[model samples]
Target: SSGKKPVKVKTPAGKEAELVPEKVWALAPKGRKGVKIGLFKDPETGKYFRHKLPDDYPI
Candidate 1:
């Protein structure tokens, strides 16, 4: 957890998980502050994100 940038992920009612896949935070949508264009890349594509990736947005 110190070599590469870690990405935080998890489910609404499950334990939180983390991944170090090649990713980038995406831009937040309207009304969302502290964003990238601040967004966390989702699943594994060109998509916007919030606090973390969706529960079932994995490959």
Candidate 2:
């Protein structure tokens, strides 16, 4: 399932989308160093998605 296919993701803003994979990055503030955020997109729908992770993703 890791074939670079567009996977539907739920975003923090309660949205759905996909991204460029490499754009995924870690985002932690105030020494928490917790969540990782990334971008995604759907080729057919022509829409992108933004979401967060627990720094243990992209598998």
Candidate 3:
């Protein structure tokens, strides 16, 4: 196991799953609250996926 514990997230299609993201960071715009974002890859299709996380959630 890669041991980078997967985080729970809902897909754009609205399905719930746990994914080991290739990267994670906050996306905060100027003068506004930021949200946590994660980048994941589909194992089968090799497509990348993005998900927004709670602002208070730890990265």
* Distance from true location, Cα of 40 in model 2, Å: 0.2
Error of 3 at 35 (Å): 0.5
lDDT of 1: 0.42
Report the lDDT tens digits of candidate 1 across residue range 1-59.
Answer: 11144456552334354654444344556776433221344444434444543433332
lDDT of 1 at 59: 23
Candidate 3 TM-score, true structure as reference: 0.64
Error of 2 at 56 (Å): 1.0
C-alpha TM-score for every candidate: 0.29, 0.50, 0.64
**Candidate 1 regions off by >4 Å?**
1-3, 11-13, 28-59
lDDT of 3 by residue, 1-59 (tens): 12156778776656677888777787889987778787877655566788875566556
Which ten residues in a row are the worst by lDDT in model 2? 1-10
| Candidate No. with top TM-score | 3
Clashing pairs in 3: none
The clash count of every prediction, one per candidate, is 5, 7, 0
How far off is residue 26 in model 1, in Å? 3.0
